[PDB]
Amino acid sequence: QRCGEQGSGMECPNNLCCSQYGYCGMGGDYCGKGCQNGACWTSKRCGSQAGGKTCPNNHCCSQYGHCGFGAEYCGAGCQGGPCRADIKCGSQAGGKLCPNNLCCSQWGYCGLGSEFCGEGCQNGACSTDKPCGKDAGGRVCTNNYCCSKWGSCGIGPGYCGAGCQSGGCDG
Amino acid sequence: QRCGEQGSGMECPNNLCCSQYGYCGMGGDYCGKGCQNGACWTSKRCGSQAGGKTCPNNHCCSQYGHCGFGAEYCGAGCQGGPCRADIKCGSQAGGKLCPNNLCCSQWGYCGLGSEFCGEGCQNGACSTDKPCGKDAGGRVCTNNYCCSKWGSCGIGPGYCGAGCQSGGCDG
């Protein structure tokens, strides 16, 4: 129930700001100076201007490299987040991965829901529990997700811990 | 560190799924059954179909009342989240409030960033910090935000507790 660095990357609900001390609220003491995520008064930098840093809380990254929502951010020139333009991925886009663990459809576009994560999903958080490892032809997961001992892809201690076969295995 | 019920509605970074037990990760153990938020494999219900409920993690709510991203969610029929169509608010939309604490610009659209939260911001997370309470004509905050004893609007103990003049106080 702590956010930001104090809460392991955790984000507040409904865009509430995470203060510099790692708590959630709204007002000058949270969204003001040292705001870590949420609706920070000084918008976070992103995109090419911030070395490819993503926006927290699924915010759109404008082309000036600033995080937010609305036409200025999600519209023309949007570099990441729920951009109003469709975002290509997968074989159709040279094996590109969707950002923010979004699922790449079979048709080559980024989204979340059964239409993207279901049948034919190419990468990201696909619902298809595709088996990996020594039991499944040696195949490794997408998105450097850990292939667990029992041959399923994921992230977390169960996948990346003891018996992790490939992926972002803990060392 | 904990997410969901266990971390008071807290959300995981990069659409990781909050498992039924309050931990963040990816894979059937987090995204499957009991997933509280994030890229859940069975998408949350939202909108008119689900009692006016919003999507976690700023996901769009489709016309059919399910949460996600991509054209089918954020495009036509979107009833919530960062829809591709501009959402109206303020004196133009009969004093409506933007969803998920977004700022209603003075031009009557919902967004986040200086264009929306700066001068003219009507409601939501405005950076302007207009004083409220006894000090400030008796002006009350927008969004049932707590007006603190020092005449600032916000959400959290310093705002909503002792000497909270108006808004969702605790006293």
Curated annotation (Swiss-Prot), chains A, B:
Residues of the Chitin-binding type-1 domain: 2-42, 43-85, 86-128, 129-171
Keyword annotations of the record: Chitin-binding, Disulfide bond, Glycoprotein, Lectin, Pyrrolidone carboxylic acid, Repeat
Organism: Triticum aestivum (Wheat)
Note: The 4 sites proposed for binding to carbohydrates (N-acetyl-D-glucosamine) of receptor molecules are on the surface of the agglutinin molecule.
Quaternary state and interactors: Homodimer, u-shaped.
Cysteine disulfide partners in this protein: 3-18, 12-24, 17-31, 35-40, 46-61, 55-67, 60-74, 78-83, 89-104, 98-110, 103-117, 121-126, 132-147, 141-153, 146-160, 164-169
GO MF annotation: an example: chitin binding
Binding residue positions for substrate: 10-12, 62-73, 114-115
Domain of life: Eukaryota
Protein name per its UniProtKB record: Agglutinin isolectin 3
Biological role stated in the UniProt entry: N-acetyl-D-glucosamine / N-acetyl-D-neuraminic acid binding lectin.
